[PDB]
Amino acid sequence: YANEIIEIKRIMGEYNLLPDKNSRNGLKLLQKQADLLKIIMEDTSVTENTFKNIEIAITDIKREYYSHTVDIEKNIHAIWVAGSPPESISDYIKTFLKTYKEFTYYLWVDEKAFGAAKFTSVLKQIAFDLACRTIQQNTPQKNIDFINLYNEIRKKYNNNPSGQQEYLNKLRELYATYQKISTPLKHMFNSFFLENMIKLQDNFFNYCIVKGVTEINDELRINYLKNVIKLSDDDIGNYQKTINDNKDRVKKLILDLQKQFGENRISIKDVNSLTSLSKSENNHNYQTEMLLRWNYPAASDLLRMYILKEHGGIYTDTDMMPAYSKQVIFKIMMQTNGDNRFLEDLKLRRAISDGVLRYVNNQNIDEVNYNEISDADKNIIKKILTEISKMPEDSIFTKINTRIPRDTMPILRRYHLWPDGWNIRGLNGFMLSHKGSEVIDAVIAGQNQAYRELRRIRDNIHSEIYFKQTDELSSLPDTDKIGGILVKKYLSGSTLQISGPDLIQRKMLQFFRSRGVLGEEFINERKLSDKAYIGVYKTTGTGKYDWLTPESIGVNDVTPADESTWCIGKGRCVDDFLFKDVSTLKTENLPELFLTKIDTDTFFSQWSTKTKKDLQKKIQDLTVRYNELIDSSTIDFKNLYEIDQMLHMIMLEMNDDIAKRSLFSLQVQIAEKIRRMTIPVDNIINIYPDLHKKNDNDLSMSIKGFLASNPHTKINILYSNKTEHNIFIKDLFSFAVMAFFKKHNENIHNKIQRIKDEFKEYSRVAIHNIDKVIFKGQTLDRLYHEGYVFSDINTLSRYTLHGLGITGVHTEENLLPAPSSSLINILKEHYNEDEISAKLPLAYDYILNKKESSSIPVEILNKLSELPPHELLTPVLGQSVNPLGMGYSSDNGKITEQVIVSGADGFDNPISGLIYTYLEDLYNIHVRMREGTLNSQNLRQLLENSVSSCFLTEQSINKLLSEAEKRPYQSLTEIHQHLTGLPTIADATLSLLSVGLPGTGKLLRREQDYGRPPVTAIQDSTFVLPYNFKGIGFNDNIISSAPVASSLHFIAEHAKYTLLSWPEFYRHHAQRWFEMAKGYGSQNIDFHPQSLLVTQEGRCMGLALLYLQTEDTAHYSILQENLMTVSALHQTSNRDKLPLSKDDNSLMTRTYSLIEMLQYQGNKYITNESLLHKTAWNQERITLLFNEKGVKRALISTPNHTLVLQQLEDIYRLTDPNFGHADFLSPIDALKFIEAMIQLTPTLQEYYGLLNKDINKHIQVHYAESDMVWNKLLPENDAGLSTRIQHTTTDRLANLAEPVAVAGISLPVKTLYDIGATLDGRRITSPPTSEQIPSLRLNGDVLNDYLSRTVLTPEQADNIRKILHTQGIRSGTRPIDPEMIRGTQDDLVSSQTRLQRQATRVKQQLAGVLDTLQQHFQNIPRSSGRHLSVENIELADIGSGRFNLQIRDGETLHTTSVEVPEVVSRFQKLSTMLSALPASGIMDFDLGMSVVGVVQYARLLQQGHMDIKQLSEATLGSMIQIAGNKFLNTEGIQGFRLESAVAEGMRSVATRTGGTMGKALSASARVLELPVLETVLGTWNLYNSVIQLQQATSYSETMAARVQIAFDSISLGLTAASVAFPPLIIATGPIAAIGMGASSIARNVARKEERHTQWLEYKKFLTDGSKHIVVASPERGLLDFSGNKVFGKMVLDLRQSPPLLHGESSFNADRKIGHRPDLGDWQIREKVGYANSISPYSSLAHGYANSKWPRTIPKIPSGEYD
């Protein structure tokens, strides 16, 4: 306790050295003393004498602390409410003046807000009309009678301005009608009303910003009203009449009051003469309160706090009188003979108060209202008043104590005898305080926070509107209840309070709790004790309160004009309402509510002729670009900068005001768009710990919490060893001025090592040294080398590391994930809102660790242990920031730097470059300051070419120079503060951005003073500070607004598909998908499979939400094309491991970040029943929803997958991300197709998670009550995915028409990019200059991949070989043998293309086969060594692909079970085709090519011969050979070679089926027969030796590469060498095969078999003819139609850049009905009538009488064909 006693001594000694102990500093010192003494009490010492001594000392400190009391000022304050009658106020004012002789009465009057009631009423009318219109015209399911009646009575008023009381009565009746409306409609009404009123207030504040006004008066309000709507002179006359009436009433009342009493005794104080009114921290909340209030006859809650803070004294309402003296109560008790009914019930007390007030004011006592009072009570009250009237006027009332403790605000406490008992509570209608009290400041801050949280409904874009929160009197101003109260007040005209007594009590309790031990007497069971109030009555009787000797003297609040009598007795005035027909609304002047494009025909309507002639042409040049910027789904900052700069220039170059207002409306639209377009945040958290605390418990808790919150979140712990060394050196220098190195190094090393080994098993936690990744020329490196030690080094390091590409969240505090709604709900069972915050640390300790606390019930522990940790904590995923790039945490509305949330990788980050340049400038100023060489000239020169020059004012330069002279060595933050005057670098971000955004940035900065959130402030906080568990957001509460947990789909350890084998799933099911979609009536089926997510974790929610967002066919097509492009890019990047250009990588990262965020949001939304309705799969209910309930979108959720049903235009489109989309005319058809697709296919059913399950209870449909909800949840910033087509590098390079001269040959830039030409380690994105050409290198992997899928001409191969021989292969990539770069003639291009396609298919199938084999081998009880060795391979079942093998594990382990029906079926089909070929010359070229490639792969696997992976590959080869031998060796010859047999079969096929196909088959057979080529063997050996071993990729990729090598070796037989200068012209066309026509198959059809088998043969012929109508090779400019057989009357038009193909497809026909393509299978069956209507779909004839061959006309790729 040397860390307690010494500071106790010094704080005591400082307490002596206080000339005036009656001050806040003395109170703080005493608080510190008592806190340290209580900390000493917490020790384990058991000495009772010590306990007594310390408690006596604490009592002494408390007694000394309470000895400091302040005498309040002799001021009595009251607020005059507009429209108040002066007769009911003068009596109470006179009573208070008479009772308080030595007091000054001040009546606060706001002369500028006399007519604000009519302005507020007009705004409310506009807001309610807008809400009604939004409800009506967006609810097409049914009409609402309430809106119709509202419009009818408004139209009835439109003809009778004269009488309005009838209108208010009709509105009351209409509210009685409205009470019966449905609950969701009520919630929507409340939300829309509140949001519209807030938006109108924002519009008024924006108008104030335009006009540049400093104060707000009634003239400005009238001008704004004329701006928004049309005001006749009668409305202005009524406004002025009510203003004059209020002025005259106030003047007459004050004159009458000053005639009797003194002139200076009572006076009028102007409300506008208040400092707090113009304070920027108050956000002009006084003006907002005039609109969002429902207790209009009462006074302002903020104004009384302002008055008490700035002046001090007593505030009282104008309906209260001083408390009765002892004599009065005494006489009442004797006159009532001891009955307590006359001192407790409201009616008799009110009558007695009326009598006393009448008697004191020299009025008629007999005229007291004795209503609802019995006659005997009337007589006894009369005699009581008669006895009282004999008393002197100076003893009727008693004063109150004016001595209060320093920094305290006593609050009046009331006792009301309700029929159910007592209703003790505090009232803000009578308060006491002195000037400058701290508790008033705390209450004001609480009120500001309350208004901030109330504005959350409008400020938060992603705010849910269907959230029926329970009634709990929570601190959050529940928007639903407040909106309902406001609607009731607007309609009816007659609880919760954002700044009422409840908030005052809560803030006072918080202040007293933060006081410490001295505040313990103010706390009474976590509430406010009796010492915090006045008028407290002690209950001497069992329950009755002794009305004789109260603890404190209060005030008689039961008066004839109190809150309970003015509701009925005082009718609503007619001077606080102004009826206006909203139909004349000017929607172009309201950018906050209406998004209006600039229309040149009507934009310049009210402009002056001079301004029109000046700048109409200039503005008309902005219409297209401005509209594109407004309607875009992404932000292009260059266009935004240009448009904003020139709009600002035009604005500054004007003299008119209407045109200025229109341009400001455009700027406001720009600002709103900037606000609304948020971007995702990477799922990364970076913590910069302070290694000087010796307590890593908080850091470990933070790491554990962020680990448990999500299993994908990366955690980076970043520390600087150089900073620790500099700190140690500075400490050594200080110790010297005022062994060790080894000790400090060991200490730091052991701390870091402990942190590292605590989370060693977690790969997501990485501890990194900052100095290891820092550029040498960077500012941070120079600061490290200069011994920078200042505290802001960590903030500068955070900024630098973000600038280095480390995205995510950067913070220094030990942040903890915020609790989710489930955890708060669990804790709420036996806790209140004020105890959950204190109990949260225990729950967090029990969740992350496994510590059990005795202070928490075991039920809580049991309920928490049953839920996953990720369901109770909020992860970093799903967060978002402003489009500017960076976000900051807030503290009481001011942005801080505790948490920095920095965008997502791939998105534009304008703030990052500004911060980088600003830090460079600050470092330059620092180095100039250090050497004392900083004056004005070099200061201006340093920022001469810098954005930060905007801060160079004369006073800023003077301050910088003065501080440099005073202290040459200053921190960078201090330099920035001196230069700019802003507290933090975060504040300077908007100022820096305003240089490039002169108008929008200035407007956004100005709007901060009117309550709008800062543009760089994060609102939804997913983090909490460890010490208090308080959120770091702007307007959020972590307890009453906790986020909903997200449903995480648990996946298997092994996935069914990888990226290599993923297309097999689509290929196996695409035909069935199309057939069954067409059979159910779909007239448009489109295919666009996704290759982005190969694992069903997340259930494809992101893609489903992306497709659901689009509301049009054009946007749908754009999004589908963009998703296909991104899928291709992802396949190239990940499956092939090929480098990508910067733009393509950025696009992929943006798309993946959006997909992850959207999938998280969708999984969150589906599990929350309050947002989206959820129903089980029922076709009738879904049809009713889509037909009667006005539902246009829905999410069909299988346990593993998600589908989308939409209502684009008039069609109903169903989207399956894995396949594509098909649209139907009616919803029932789509639902039937969905159900059929789910049930019919077993593999698809198992993959989707519905295997052996009832789908009527395992399929859920998610929809919204209204279509607005989707617009609210789905983000607006789509990165341009659904509005514009994103072009890759190849697409842009294809537009260039100039070639590049490389190695003496000119080739296009696109071709150079395709072959992998890398410049300076990057793939070329632009035509390289002649200087950079010698530095060009060819990427081996890219070149190999290009050669894999390209059929070059011999000249192209020659050119590629020349380029390779001149430039070479980039080091570290795949070497390429020049002899492998060959070309083919025109007649073999189709064969080469089919061979390459077969190679791809075989690779994809063998990848899955190898994965299955590896899983089988891993399922074996292995011990050690190379024991796994297959002993025999044979296929027992030829019809199913079952192989039996034995393993020489050494323990005799045998598992003879593996299903490989892929290799077996290929050879089965080959044998069948070979045997049946002599009967009819029908063969499959693709099947033969695939068989040849597989055989060659096995043969290459033979030569050049042991872990599980290579064993599996060798086993696959062995099974290939075994299947080939079984299905090809008819006779058991020992000297049997599979290659020879396959070659002989191919030669037989080629001889019997001649032509170019026969030539290709002969070439492949010859390749198989001959020994492997030297080049092929060299390539195989080089790969297997160096390239596979060097890379760490999976074995599947290596196997696929080997298969590709084998297929390339097969492909070498179809190539030919170039011929130079051919002397003679030869024939270069393909040769037709024997049996092209349909007579060949018809010859075998004539064999007497089943008729349906003959039709199957005919259909096979038709499908083969339609499969290969066109083969396009735009690289060579070749079009191949030789495979066309069933596309008649073909017309090829090469005039257009994409050639047009037209023709007639072969079709099915029926004898009676003919060909009817427009009908589905069921309609065709009904027409023909060949079956029953209840027959299964499998019993029908699919494709009958409605089939076409080909299905659709093929599309020729764009190119130049010769």
Numbering used by the authors: 241 to 734, 751 to 994, 1119 to 1885, 1897 to 2153
Sentences from the paper on this structure:
The C-terminal arm adopted two different conformations. In conformation I the C-terminal arm was shorter and more compact, while in conformation II the C-terminal arm was extended. At pH 4.0, we found the same two conformations with some 40% of LifA attributed to conformation I. The ratio between conformation I and II did not change significantly upon changing the pH and conformation II was the most abundant conformation at pH 4.0 and 6.5. Vice versa, conformation I had disappeared, which suggested that conformation I was a low-pH form and conformation III was a high-pH form. The rearrangement positioned the ART-domain at different locations relative to the N-terminus: In conformation I, the ART-domain was folded beneath the delivery domain. The relative arrangement of the domains downstream of S1 (S2–S4 and ART-domain) changed between conformation I and II. In conformation I, S3 formed two salt bridges with the vertex domain (E1759-K2782 and D1757-R2877). The C-terminal subdomain adopted two different orientations relative to the N-terminal subdomain. In conformation I and II it formed a compact entity with the N-terminal subdomain, which was stabilised by a hydrogen bond between the subdomains (V1731–Q1776).
